[PDB]
Amino acid sequence: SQQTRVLQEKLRKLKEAMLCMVCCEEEINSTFCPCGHTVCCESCAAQLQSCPVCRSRVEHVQHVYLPTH
Amino acid sequence: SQQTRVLQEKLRKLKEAMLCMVCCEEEINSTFCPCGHTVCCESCAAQLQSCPVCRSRVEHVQHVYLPTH
Ligand SMILES: [Zn+2]
Ligand SMILES: [Zn+2]
Ligand SMILES: [Zn+2]
Ligand SMILES: [Zn+2]
Numbered sequence A, B: 001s002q003q004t005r006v007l008q009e010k011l012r013k014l015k016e017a018m019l020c021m022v023c024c025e026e027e028i029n030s031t032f033c034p035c036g037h038t039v040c041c042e043s044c045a046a047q048l049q050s051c052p053v054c055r056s057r058v059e060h061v062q063h064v065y066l067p068t069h
Helices: A002-017 A042-046 B002-017 B042-046
Strands: A030-033 A060-063 B030-033 B060-063
Touching: A002 B002, A030 A042, A042 A060, B030 B042, B042 B060
Parallel strands: none
Antiparallel strands: A030 A060, B030 B060
16 A cells, blocks of 8 residues: 555665664664764774764764664 | 555564663663663663673763664
8 A cells, every 4th residue: 555655665764764874884883982973883983083973073982782783 | 455564563663672671661862881782761771880781880871862863
């Protein structure tokens, strides 16, 4: 039905929100500290000196274990 | 259709996995450091001395901004 297409789109948008904002290929699993933006996979987070959301300096990267992983 | 029911269930299960493991009511937005388990809302994470998943000592709590929020 049309509701199947609407639900497929909601699922797609939610799955895309879980993907790294830089590479768009791997699941987000890393937090920039101290700002707390959690938007990258470990490989892109290792290569950024500034947060790509707020531009604050990255003092270190915290790995995050989420239940949805 | 039955396909619509299947997609509704996937969406529901994903949204339920995003809720605090202690209160089951608020969105997960906090990480226990250094272990990295990200399973609680701010209020439930604030008083735990040890991680509820792995029993490691909680040195501090890092707030996380998640794009799925
Ligand atoms: Zn990446
Ligand atoms: Zn930031
Ligand atoms: Zn809670
Ligand atoms: Zn832990």
